[PDB]
Design an enzyme around this catalytic site. Sequence first.
Site, PDB file in Angstrom:
ATOM      1  N   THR A 138       8.461 -10.375   6.957  1.00 17.99           N
ATOM      2  CA  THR A 138       8.651 -11.319   5.858  1.00 17.99           C
ATOM      3  C   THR A 138       9.133 -12.660   6.415  1.00 17.99           C
ATOM      4  O   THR A 138      10.105 -12.691   7.155  1.00 17.99           O
ATOM      5  CB  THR A 138       9.672 -10.761   4.859  1.00 17.99           C
ATOM      6  OG1 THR A 138       9.113  -9.596   4.240  1.00 17.99           O
ATOM      7  CG2 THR A 138      10.008 -11.782   3.776  1.00 17.99           C
TER       8      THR A 138
ATOM      9  N   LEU B  50      16.612  10.821   0.609  1.00 20.40           N
ATOM     10  CA  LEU B  50      16.857   9.958  -0.550  1.00 20.40           C
ATOM     11  C   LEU B  50      18.114   9.128  -0.352  1.00 20.40           C
ATOM     12  O   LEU B  50      19.171   9.661   0.007  1.00 20.40           O
ATOM     13  CB  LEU B  50      17.009  10.808  -1.803  1.00 20.40           C
ATOM     14  CG  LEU B  50      17.389  10.094  -3.095  1.00 20.40           C
ATOM     15  CD1 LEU B  50      16.280   9.170  -3.527  1.00 20.40           C
ATOM     16  CD2 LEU B  50      17.677  11.111  -4.182  1.00 20.40           C
TER      17      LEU B  50
ATOM     18  N   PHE C 214       0.806  -1.228   0.000  1.00 23.63           N
ATOM     19  CA  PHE C 214       0.000   0.000   0.000  1.00 23.63           C
ATOM     20  C   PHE C 214       0.839   1.279   0.000  1.00 23.63           C
ATOM     21  O   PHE C 214       0.338   2.365   0.311  1.00 23.63           O
ATOM     22  CB  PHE C 214      -1.013  -0.001   1.155  1.00 23.63           C
ATOM     23  CG  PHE C 214      -2.061  -1.077   1.040  1.00 23.63           C
ATOM     24  CD1 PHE C 214      -2.967  -1.083  -0.019  1.00 23.63           C
ATOM     25  CD2 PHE C 214      -2.131  -2.096   1.983  1.00 23.63           C
ATOM     26  CE1 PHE C 214      -3.933  -2.092  -0.132  1.00 23.63           C
ATOM     27  CE2 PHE C 214      -3.090  -3.104   1.879  1.00 23.63           C
ATOM     28  CZ  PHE C 214      -3.992  -3.100   0.817  1.00 23.63           C
TER      29      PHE C 214
ATOM     30  N   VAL D 154       4.014   3.495  -2.328  1.00 24.04           N
ATOM     31  CA  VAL D 154       4.863   3.665  -3.508  1.00 24.04           C
ATOM     32  C   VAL D 154       5.850   4.784  -3.193  1.00 24.04           C
ATOM     33  O   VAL D 154       5.473   5.790  -2.592  1.00 24.04           O
ATOM     34  CB  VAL D 154       4.028   3.928  -4.801  1.00 24.04           C
ATOM     35  CG1 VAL D 154       3.193   5.191  -4.699  1.00 24.04           C
ATOM     36  CG2 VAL D 154       4.921   3.980  -6.023  1.00 24.04           C
TER      37      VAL D 154
ATOM     38  N   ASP E 153      12.316   1.919   5.768  1.00 24.33           N
ATOM     39  CA  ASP E 153      11.039   1.215   5.965  1.00 24.33           C
ATOM     40  C   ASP E 153      10.699   0.958   7.428  1.00 24.33           C
ATOM     41  O   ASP E 153      10.856  -0.157   7.959  1.00 24.33           O
ATOM     42  CB  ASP E 153      10.909  -0.058   5.139  1.00 24.33           C
ATOM     43  CG  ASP E 153       9.497  -0.582   5.109  1.00 24.33           C
ATOM     44  OD1 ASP E 153       8.611  -0.012   5.789  1.00 24.33           O
ATOM     45  OD2 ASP E 153       9.275  -1.584   4.393  1.00 24.33           O
TER      46      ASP E 153
ATOM     47  N   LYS F 230      15.797  -6.621   6.690  1.00 29.17           N
ATOM     48  CA  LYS F 230      16.087  -7.546   5.585  1.00 29.17           C
ATOM     49  C   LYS F 230      16.850  -6.751   4.535  1.00 29.17           C
ATOM     50  O   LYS F 230      16.862  -5.526   4.579  1.00 29.17           O
ATOM     51  CB  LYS F 230      14.809  -8.126   4.977  1.00 29.17           C
ATOM     52  CG  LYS F 230      13.758  -7.085   4.603  1.00 29.17           C
ATOM     53  CD  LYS F 230      12.554  -7.764   3.998  1.00 29.17           C
ATOM     54  CE  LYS F 230      11.483  -6.746   3.651  1.00 29.17           C
ATOM     55  NZ  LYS F 230      10.261  -7.355   3.031  1.00 29.17           N
TER      56      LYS F 230
ATOM     57  N   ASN G 203      15.386  -3.679   2.845  1.00 26.86           N
ATOM     58  CA  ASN G 203      15.228  -2.500   3.718  1.00 26.86           C
ATOM     59  C   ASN G 203      16.536  -1.877   4.184  1.00 26.86           C
ATOM     60  O   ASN G 203      16.567  -1.126   5.155  1.00 26.86           O
ATOM     61  CB  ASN G 203      14.326  -2.829   4.920  1.00 26.86           C
ATOM     62  CG  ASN G 203      12.874  -2.997   4.529  1.00 26.86           C
ATOM     63  OD1 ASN G 203      12.082  -3.609   5.253  1.00 26.86           O
ATOM     64  ND2 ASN G 203      12.507  -2.451   3.380  1.00 26.86           N
TER      65      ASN G 203
ATOM     66  N   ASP H 259      11.367  -5.242  10.745  1.00 21.76           N
ATOM     67  CA  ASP H 259      11.328  -5.614   9.315  1.00 21.76           C
ATOM     68  C   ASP H 259      12.725  -5.516   8.697  1.00 21.76           C
ATOM     69  O   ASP H 259      12.880  -5.078   7.566  1.00 21.76           O
ATOM     70  CB  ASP H 259      10.325  -4.707   8.566  1.00 21.76           C
ATOM     71  CG  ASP H 259       9.831  -5.287   7.249  1.00 21.76           C
ATOM     72  OD1 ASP H 259       9.916  -6.516   7.034  1.00 21.76           O
ATOM     73  OD2 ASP H 259       9.314  -4.477   6.427  1.00 21.76           O
TER      74      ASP H 259
HETATM   75  N1  ADP Z   1      14.441   6.808   1.570  1.00 25.03           N
HETATM   76  C1  ADP Z   1      14.419   6.024   0.466  1.00 25.03           C
HETATM   77  N2  ADP Z   1      15.278   6.238  -0.551  1.00 25.03           N
HETATM   78  C2  ADP Z   1      15.266   5.451  -1.655  1.00 25.03           C
HETATM   79  N3  ADP Z   1      14.416   4.414  -1.819  1.00 25.03           N
HETATM   80  C3  ADP Z   1      13.507   4.094  -0.868  1.00 25.03           C
HETATM   81  C4  ADP Z   1      13.470   4.897   0.358  1.00 25.03           C
HETATM   82  N4  ADP Z   1      12.493   4.393   1.119  1.00 25.03           N
HETATM   83  C5  ADP Z   1      11.954   3.338   0.449  1.00 25.03           C
HETATM   84  N5  ADP Z   1      12.567   3.152  -0.741  1.00 25.03           N
HETATM   85  C6  ADP Z   1      12.258   2.089  -1.741  1.00 25.03           C
HETATM   86  O1  ADP Z   1      10.875   1.737  -1.663  1.00 25.03           O
HETATM   87  C7  ADP Z   1      10.734   0.358  -1.288  1.00 25.03           C
HETATM   88  C8  ADP Z   1       9.548   0.175  -0.363  1.00 25.03           C
HETATM   89  O2  ADP Z   1       9.826   0.897   0.832  1.00 25.03           O
HETATM   90  P1  ADP Z   1       8.655   1.251   1.869  1.00 25.03           P
HETATM   91  O3  ADP Z   1       7.515   1.841   1.066  1.00 25.03           O
HETATM   92  O4  ADP Z   1       9.329   2.063   2.947  1.00 25.03           O
HETATM   93  O5  ADP Z   1       8.160  -0.178   2.434  1.00 25.03           O
HETATM   94  P2  ADP Z   1       6.644  -0.477   2.942  1.00 25.03           P
HETATM   95  O6  ADP Z   1       5.727   0.049   1.867  1.00 25.03           O
HETATM   96  O7  ADP Z   1       6.628  -1.986   3.087  1.00 25.03           O
HETATM   97  O8  ADP Z   1       6.494   0.266   4.254  1.00 25.03           O
HETATM   98  C9  ADP Z   1      12.053  -0.004  -0.625  1.00 25.03           C
HETATM   99  O9  ADP Z   1      12.317  -1.413  -0.614  1.00 25.03           O
HETATM  100  C10 ADP Z   1      13.048   0.818  -1.420  1.00 25.03           C
HETATM  101  O10 ADP Z   1      13.394   0.130  -2.633  1.00 25.03           O
END
Ligand code: ADP
Length: 280
Positions: A179, A94, A23, A25, A160, A140, A143, A138
């Site tokens: 997971t 980022l 849920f 992106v 995450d 892994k 993350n 979480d």
């Molecule tokens: N701060 C960030 N910078 C770059 N990529 C990110 C960052 N946070 C998350 N991502 C990308 O988005 C993916 C999903 O992360 P996230 O949405 O935090 O997980 P979830 O939706 O399970 O909580 C990560 O596995 C990573 O590839």
Amino acid sequence: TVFRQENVDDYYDTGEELGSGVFAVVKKCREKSTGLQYAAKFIKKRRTKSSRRGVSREDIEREVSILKEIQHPNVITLHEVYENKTDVILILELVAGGELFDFLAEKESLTEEEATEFLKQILNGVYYLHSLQIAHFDLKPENIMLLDRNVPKPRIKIIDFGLAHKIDFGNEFKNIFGTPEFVAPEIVNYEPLGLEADMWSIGVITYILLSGASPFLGDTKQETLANVSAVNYEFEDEYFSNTSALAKDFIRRLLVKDPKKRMTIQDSLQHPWIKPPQFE
Ligand SMILES: Nc1ncnc2c1ncn2[C@@H]1O[C@H](COP(=O)(O)OP(=O)(O)O)[C@@H](O)[C@H]1O
């Protein structure tokens, strides 16, 4: 807690998608006023109280509250939060060098030093979190992000915080399940959870870093979970024959069923090797 309700598009431009989840992106973005780049995580809200789609407001607010607390080189920094009728939008630091997961897939096999160089940073970030009584829940390779994947010793940040919880009573008892490949036995068994669960996950990550193989992974989620609960893993000679016995000792002391007997984060930093969803 309410967040900024102006249109994020008035303040940011978005680009490349960085990741995609159940849920959430995550999209690269740039703040118009500064030119600085961030990762915008769009989390879908629940449309009704009893709904199973989207993330509950309680769960969103917890992630934001934990993110607001943290500032450490090995964890992500929260910049701003926006919201509208459908989404909460976290503007995150980022991390542009991709997932540790993808780095491992492209290299196929690390040296023991390369593994420890990653591990030491993971341990430093988790030491910080656990010092704050924050369990990540979480951990892994997906993350753990690299800042720059084209240097010999890539720097990392833990990302995450969607399952993270404050543990002010030594354990918590909620709906928490990560997971299957990475969860501790107490997660599998629906027992109270604490900081110890993260230490088990670190053991699994370490095994993967050294061997390219996953210690409990079965052909189905149920098989993986049964393996975890039974501590059904071993060090395959094909993968570990040139890995030091001390490295194996470190893993053995983390992959312990009883959370009380598992190494703590402080133990892991003093260990001689270091010391210088769930349903099909
Ligand atoms: N701060 C960030 N910078 C770059 N990529 C990110 C960052 N946070 C998350 N991502 C990308 O988005 C993916 C999903 O992360 P996230 O949405 O935090 O997980 P979830 O939706 O399970 O909580 C990560 O596995 C990573 O590839």
